[PDB]
UniProtKB/Swiss-Prot annotation, chain A:
The postsynaptic actions of Glu are mediated by a variety of receptors that are named according to their selective agonists. This receptor binds domoate > kainate > L-glutamate = quisqualate > CNQX = DNQX > AMPA > dihydrokainate > NMDA. It comes from Rattus norvegicus (Rat). Homotetramer or heterotetramer of pore-forming glutamate receptor subunits. Tetramers may be formed by the dimerization of dimers. Can form functional heteromeric receptors with GRIK4 and GRIK5. Interacts with KLHL17. It is found in: Cell membrane; Postsynaptic cell membrane. This is Glutamate receptor ionotropic, kainate 1. The chain holds residues 203 to 253 of 949 of the full protein. Belongs to the glutamate-gated ion channel (TC 1.A.10.1) family. GRIK1 subfamily.
UniProtKB/Swiss-Prot annotation, chain B:
Glycans are attached at residues 34, 40. Homotetramer or heterotetramer of pore-forming glutamate receptor subunits. Tetramers may be formed by the dimerization of dimers. Can form functional heteromeric receptors with GRIK4 and GRIK5. Interacts with KLHL17. Belongs to the glutamate-gated ion channel (TC 1.A.10.1) family. GRIK1 subfamily. The postsynaptic actions of Glu are mediated by a variety of receptors that are named according to their selective agonists. This receptor binds domoate > kainate > L-glutamate = quisqualate > CNQX = DNQX > AMPA > dihydrokainate > NMDA. Ionotropic glutamate receptor that functions as a cation-permeable ligand-gated ion channel, gated by L-glutamate and the glutamatergic agonist kainic acid. L-glutamate acts as an excitatory neurotransmitter at many synapses in the central nervous system. Binding of the excitatory neurotransmitter L-glutamate induces a conformation change, leading to the opening of the cation channel, and thereby converts the chemical signal to an electrical impulse. The receptor then desensitizes rapidly and enters a transient inactive state, characterized by the presence of bound agonist. It comes from the Eukaryota. The chain holds residues 36 to 202 of 949 of the full protein. This is Glutamate receptor ionotropic, kainate 1. Expressed in the olfactory bulb (at protein level). Expressed in subsets of neurons throughout the developing and adult central and peripheral nervous systems. In the CNS principally in the medial amygdaloid nuclei, medial habenulae, pyriform and cingulate cortices, and Purkinje cell layer. Also highly expressed in embryonic and adult dorsal root ganglia. Expressed at high levels in the trigeminal ganglion neurons. The gene is Grik1. It is found in: Cell membrane; Postsynaptic cell membrane.
């Protein structure tokens, strides 16, 4: 998959990823968008011991 | 033409102005706004700010207020103080209007107080009715203090009657 | 599935928790669906903003606290009673000689058997106990659009 | 001119005279167990009834000595509910199928 370019809220991407049950995720990001996607993956509640 | 009420408010210090006292002054200013509520009388207020956890000071202020002339008292937040002011008002036959619910020692036979907080038994019955709606089977009751166990009395005792395991 | 039996859940900033997926049923005493009640709570939040505000004295988003609502209902209750009353004066009492109020049980009855629709819904009193018996506890739950009444 | 007061035997009637004894600095001597007041900053009261927390630790110790696997806590008043708290919380720590 690819995180959306302009609208930095990737919550539809994380919602589809959570819906299709993908627990082992590899991100290729810079550190700024890595921190923003860590905030967004916390807000989606996908910071469990399953992921 | 005047009608004077009184309010005893507990505050730690004056930086956190009491939202209870702010709502009290807000309500009396909105009553003085509205002229559909017996406009020939004006409802004025008399505040007494006391320290936190002082039944003796609460009694002193209530006495001074009833010596000044008060139609109804709005007691403090702490339970011993509001029970002391409630017993003062029950002896003096002035109405006491409290908004904080108290510990279940209400067997003091009084009829000169109204407690606008909902009944702690009724809240427990509502929690039980909602859990019976949601059809849970294992529920972990988590409280904060003994007031919480009194308020969840019905839910905790509910399992013998209905099939639900409860960890507290 | 968390269930908070505190009557102040609505006044909590639940956006981060909202985007998670928790079933987060709670409670609410205020019938804020009423237009008059919503205008009153908006007027109170507007009055509390022209003052120098107190953020992080709690996690209210700029709402009315339940204790503030009950005190507002209390002064409206004694105001309803005094409006419905006769020529209710006020007698300066004592404490060393507890002389009873000569208007006392009359005005206490005219408080207790008085019904009024306040910010916490209906305000009625079973006259044998003084507690508040008939009242509506609205159920709120946390979904993706915030806190909705269910 | 009393040196020390021996108050009444109910909670609302004793929490007024305890605050009077605190504000006038005479020793209040409570005998019955009082409801738990959240301040614990009143200084001039002594109390001879052993507290409900230690009584509840005693009933938990004696249940654990008797090795009861499922008990039936029966109370008659919430003062009692406050007292049996250790036993009620115990299922989380020790294997007891409690029922109230």
């Amino acid at each position: 998959r690819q995180l959306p370019p302009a609208n930095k809220d990737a919550k539809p991407l994380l919602k589809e990823m959570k819906k299709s049950k993908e627990f082992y995720v590899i991100f290729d990001c810079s550190h700024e968008t890595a921190a923003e996607i860590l905030k967004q993956i916390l807000f989606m509640g996908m910071m469990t011991e399953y992921y | 033409h005047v009608l004077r009420i009184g309010g005893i408010f507990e505050t730690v210090e004056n930086e956190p102005v009491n939202v209870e006292e702010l709502a009290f002054k807000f309500a009396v200013t909105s009553i003085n706004r509205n002229r559909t509520l017996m406009p020939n009388t004006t409802l004025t207020y008399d505040i007494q700010r006391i320290n936190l956890f002082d039944s003796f000071e609460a009694s002193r202020r209530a006495c001074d207020q009833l010596a000044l002339g008060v139609a109804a008292l709005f007691g403090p937040s702490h339970s011993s103080s509001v029970s002391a002011v409630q017993s003062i008002c029950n002896a003096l036959e002035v109405p006491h209007i409290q908004t904080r619910w108290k510990h279940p020692s209400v067997d003091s036979r009084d009829l000169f107080y109204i407690n606008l907080y909902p009944d702690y038994a009724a809240i427990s019955r509502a929690v039980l009715d909602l859990v019976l709606y949601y059809n849970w089977k294992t529920v972990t009751v988590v409280y904060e203090d003994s007031t919480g166990l009194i308020r969840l009395q019905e839910l905790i005792k509910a399992p013998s009657r209905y099939n639900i395991k409860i960890k507290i | 599935h968390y269930f908070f039996t505190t009557l102040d859940l609505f006044a909590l900033d639940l956006e981060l928790y909202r985007y998670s997926g928790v079933n987060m049923t709670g409670f609410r005493l205020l019938n804020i669906d009423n237009p008059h009640v919503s205008s009153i709570i908006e007027k109170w939040s507007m009055e509390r903003l022209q003052a120098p505000p107190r953020p992080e004295t709690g996690l209210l988003d700029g709402m009315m606290t339940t204790e503030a609502a009950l005190m507002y209902d209390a002064v409206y209750m004694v105001a309803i009673a005094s409006h419905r009353a006769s020529q209710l004066t006020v007698s300066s009492l004592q404490c060393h000689r507890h002389k009873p109020w000569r208007l006392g049980p009359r005005f206490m009855n005219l408080i207790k058997e008085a019904r009024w629709d306040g910010l916490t819904g209906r305000i009625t009193f079973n006259k044998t106990d003084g507690l508040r018996k008939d009242f509506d506890l609205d159920i709120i739950s946390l979904k993706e659009e915030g806190t909705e009444k269910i």
